[PDB]
Amino acid sequence: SPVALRQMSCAAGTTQTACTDDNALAYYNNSKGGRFVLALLSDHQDLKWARFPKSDGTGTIYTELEPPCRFVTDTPKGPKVKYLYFIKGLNNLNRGMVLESLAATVRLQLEHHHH
Amino acid sequence: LSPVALRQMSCAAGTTQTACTDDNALAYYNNSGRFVLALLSDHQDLKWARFPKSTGTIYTELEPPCRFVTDTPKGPKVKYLYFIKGLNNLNRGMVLESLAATVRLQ
The dihedrals phi and psi of B94, each to the nearest 5 degrees, come to -70, -35
In single-letter form, the type of residue at position A37 comes to V
Beta bridge partners of B36: B29
Return all residues near B50 (Cβ < 8 A) that are at least 6 apart.
Answer: B11, B12, B13, B17, B20, B57, B58, B59, B60
Asked if B5 has any chain A CB less than 8 Å from its own CB, the reply is: yes
Q: Which domains does chain B have, with CATH numbers?
A: 6-106 (2.40.10.250)
∠ CA B90-A79-A98 to the nearest 5 degrees?
Answer: 20
Candidates B79, B97, B99: best to mutate against A (most CBs of A within 10 A) is: B97
CA distance B100 to A92: 17
CA distance B49 to B53: 12
- Contact pairs from chain A to chain B, CB under 8 Å: 75
CA-based end-to-end distance of chain B? 38
Helix or strand or coil: residue B94?
Answer: helix
Asked if A95 has any chain B CB less than 8 Å from its own CB, the reply is: yes
Nearest to A97 among B4, B93, B103 (CB): B93
C-beta atoms of A96 and B104 within 8 A: no
CA A15 to chain B, closest CA, distance in angstroms equals 30
Nearest CA in chain B to A101: B97
Nearest to B89 among A1, A96, A106 (CB): A96
Mark out the alpha helices in chain A (DSSP H runs): 92-103
Name every chain A residue with its beta carbon within 8 A of the beta carbon of B93.
92-100
Q: In what order do the strands lie in the sheet containing B77-83?
A: B58-61, B48-51, B7-14, B23-30, B35-41, B77-83, B66-70
Return all residues near A41 (Cβ < 8 A) that are at least 6 apart.
Answer: A24, A25, A26, A27, A82, A83, A84, A85, A102
Specified resolution (Å): 2.6
Nearest CA in chain A to B67: A1
Name every chain B residue with its beta carbon within 8 A of the beta carbon of A101.
97, 101
Closest to A97 (Cα-Cα) out of B66, B82, B92, B30: B92
Nearest CA in chain A to B102: A108
